[PDB]
Point group: D3
Chain length 244, copies 6
């Protein structure tokens, strides 16, 4: 009697497990349907040489999938070799998070963000940003309690999602692997709580998209992301009071 499946504009089940593991300053396991990512935030009291003494901090991200995160085993990036996909994804995650951090208020420190995918079924890079934001704020909460910053140094909430145009379905939100593999167009969107973009990346896959479709895709991603931000706020509990 229950409706089976998801509507075109409906997220998979989202669960954000906070203080997931003990050692990081900030630790999260994010579940987006079958996609599962361990996100940690590590605080180092150093910044890269290129910016030392300038009084601003930095955020840098690393990404990997455990070999059987995927249905078909993947070759370990062991040192093995780092794929272009990993490199692109790392750049995306780091750029996205830097955009919402008040780097001056962070002070001269680096946030090392690690996103390790333990199960992959689509949307890993955007799940990674969504989980890593929370992990970062959990770390920022510890700094604040330690009196090492005067506020949580974030300018807003930040979350991310995929959207796509899928064979015989049209515009769909939060694609699983099966859906992305038969998507004509796919897109990653990274947005703040005030509805402002930090990153938009759309790709026609052997195919093309109109501007009408771009607007459609974005519309759908915006609401997915506002919902994700609601969930981040659910996960963050009282910490939301330390953010404006």
């Amino acid at each position: 009697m229950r409706v089976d499946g998801r509507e075109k504009t409906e997220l998979r089940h989202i669960h954000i497990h906070t203080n997931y593991l003990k050692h990081p300053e900030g630790s999260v396991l994010i579940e987006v349907g079958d996609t599962k990512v361990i996100c940690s935030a590590t605080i180092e009291e150093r910044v890269p040489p290129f910016m030392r003494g300038e009084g601003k901090g930095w955020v840098t991200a690393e990404y990997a999938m455990i070999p059987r995160a995927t249905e078909q085993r993947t070759i370990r990036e062991s040192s093995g070799k780092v794929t272009g996909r990993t490199m692109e994804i790392q750049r995306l995650i780091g750029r996205a998070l830097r955009a919402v951090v008040d780097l001056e208020a962070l002070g001269e420190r680096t946030v090392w963000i690690d996103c390790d995918v333990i199960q992959a079924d689509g949307g890993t890079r955007t799940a990674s940003i969504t989980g890593a934001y929370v992990a970062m704020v959990l770390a920022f909460e510890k700094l604040l309690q330690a009196e090492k910053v005067s506020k949580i140094p974030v300018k807003d909430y930040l979350a991310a999602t995929s959207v796509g145009i899928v064979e015989e379905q049209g515009v769909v939100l939060d694609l699983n692997y099966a859906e992305d593999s038969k998507a004509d167009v796919d897109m990653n969107v990274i947005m703040t709580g005030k509805g402002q973009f930090v990153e938009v990346q759309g790709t026609g896959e052997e195919a093309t998209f109109s501007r009408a479709q771009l607007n459609e895709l974005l519309d759908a991603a915006e609401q997915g992301i506002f919902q994700l931000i609601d969930i981040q706020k659910e996960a963050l509990g009282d910490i939301v009071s330390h953010i404006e």
Copy 2:
């Protein structure tokens, strides 16, 4: 008495030198202001194992900058080590070109696209796609004359440009390096002759963008790209008759 400089919505000087060098199936030097890129297309009568026997072709791209392409010398990616930036750029160029190739009509062959930047002043990745399209079509023209394909296997023209929101200037088109380094938002846009998108990638740099701005940025990129396509047609001479 002549107006100095460029309007906000004006491209740098664009020059596409065809049959630039002798050995490639297709060879171009593209100049976009001070940005200069050698683009070759190489035809190999093989496709990757993952798709062999399926009767479709493939396009794959490589990118590098000679060490003093840039004002400050860059460390050679010698084997040295391949940067995330290079890997992202290669993925972009290959995805963009694959989208406009009729891969079945190409047959089981790979187009190896090489983009070697000899002078860099912003917009190298988009200059690379713009030049590489022409290099690819020059190669496709040779195949056609050789009776190895029945038409030039392209679905449209394809070109690319950057756009950005720049401190105290607002929306500007085709950013040089100086302008991109003080850009709050920058964007790469890849579009066809029919005004359809193949790739859109926008990044807030320590900052964010509204949807209004996204539409503005896109508007400006569309016309830059239609102009670039006009120039590609200028460069292509009679070959335009072999394309629909």
Copy 3:
């Protein structure tokens, strides 16, 4: 009123979570106190060239720690570089598991064992073998149900533990990181359900051990391991009926 801490000859809390993740043929999360390891078993219908056509199978293992598995962040082995410690650990895990597999009954297939440490507090390599055994048998159960083997191709149960001689404590079982870092002697022991050894590795750390101590250390490891095997049997449920 409750006794705090552990006796010298007492394991940390052991928990073996079976069918932990969806994609592997066999999946386990093993917890040994704060030490936590994701263990998967992947079946490939191929063996290495050096033994192809000989009708026997193979087991091979890979190991990694996520960067903040540890209290102090570790540099990612990304491709980064693979440490001697990782290489030694992989060799240990693979050798240990091969010893208890009936490789002829497995047929010509490789078991790929992946051990990804998500939290490290000592005993990761032995926790890895203990968890990976179960993951492997879970995979062997699927093969059997699929009629691809005639029995679970194991010759016995197999588990592993550390033991050590610790400053001002003497012989202690299952060392955490703190305890191993002030251990004069440490040892890894790998044993079967019939009390037979597959691997024994003892190291004096800036110090030495007598034969009396070796016997003592082994005695203590044997019972730790019999207890671990009891727990593996608890985790395996009805599958124990398919093993002799």
Copy 4:
């Protein structure tokens, strides 16, 4: 009616384009027939640790070919892997140029020489030295104008050429690729304006050479090189007045 081809002792067409690109201290495109090499000279106000504080400068060279410089595409040395041929060639170019620089007069600075081959048809390493000398002197001219050196710190002019013994032709000067591939003996010669050698490298290819032939080969290289030096002087214009 015009004689087709080249005499045995005749260079290909030589063209040295100065101030070729904007960013280097010294920039040249050298053309030797179909062989074309972009040569830059970059000044860094540092020397290697092994010689720091000793008041002498250094010259170091890097070499690469763009993938379709060659008739058959070459695999990119991307980081891919650096070939022995590249390593030998780099050593040759750097040794040759160091020999003619007054390193004390240079002061404690490194000249980074980059030789990127955009079209290859034989003689790339010697074309590289010939072009790179000019690029280096163009850089030295800028230093002098900047009052950072008291003279152009060169001890002489320097140029280089190949010579060979070719099936059914005997001793020939400046070999193209076709001619080198059927050469029994080939040789690289590096000489100054005063007729003094900096490097001589002769190789019997599946074959051997007499001393008579060595003298013959050298005779022919000497005059090729004096001609090349004349052309370097043509390219250098008024700068020749700043050299003795």
Copy 5:
């Protein structure tokens, strides 16, 4: 009339050639039957950063086999790639030697131990430790004569051997390659002159061992090692007077 071959509990011919080569502080060629290893000890007046200023020294070891050390040529570990076997062996040699060095008395210096195998017929890692101990003491003798240490900074003699359980032979000592390749169990033992262990590593190869067998194997290794120590003392000549 002479008995051919070796008893089960008998070493191969052992020869330790001291001051073998000129450049190292300590140089040995050790022969164990056909197994031959060049062992050098190099003194560097530095320790790793992780322990600098703490006043203790360090020992670190490297291992390689020349390509035709083995009956079947091995691929050179050139940079090629370093095997897990090499990494494990290096760790073993370094750990073993550190255990018998008085690191405080050494002072803040590193002993670089190099073990290059020129002929391999089993027992290379244990031959390496046995030879490297002597090479190290030869180096320590030079330091002492130079008044850079107040005694030879060793706590004891140290040597090593393999033992195994071999098809149709039972417990055998010092296995050649042929014997190890049909060994059900093999073991490396590292012991001091006072009969105390520094390392014990036993591996069931597709098979298992009882505790009775472990004791048997150890018994046999102890006497092999006492014999090896006698030979080290033979090789060391008068230097034995500088050790307690």
Copy 6:
């Protein structure tokens, strides 16, 4: 009363130890004064793909120095990284030996030449060729006895030496390390028993050489090499009868 030292035109002590080690088809230790190199020749019944089915064989060489071959320890090329010097040297050794092998008579087989330097005091690359020739002929003798070739497939004897112009000494033959480090000019010469060259490589080191000096240097190398060939013949014993 004995004259101390060497004349300007005199080799160091040369010793060629044949059948040095057991496993190679051909094995030599060559001593040239303090320079000592283990040279092996390995026969593989395969040639590279680029020449398969063409009925000719191949020779390829690898070179390394053990870390304390040198007075100052060298970093191991472990996989560490392969130096340009090693790559150049390998190319030299392989080219030199190929020139004197009848590759058709060899048949479709590769000779793998390994040159491992155990002590370095100048002239390692030329010592390597001199020793490796003998190792190769020892291997060719085994092939002949096995009826796998119809003659020793060499066209002549081949040996090599350095020569140099040394501060306050002029032209000197067979330079040690000290002498090469204060050499204005150095040269490697590779010659056959009939006085024909296979390779000549001369380098002015911060300095230049005249043609008169080139002739002088060569004269001196020729006689050094004829002497070396005499010694190779001494080492080869009766095998000289199987060569013309």
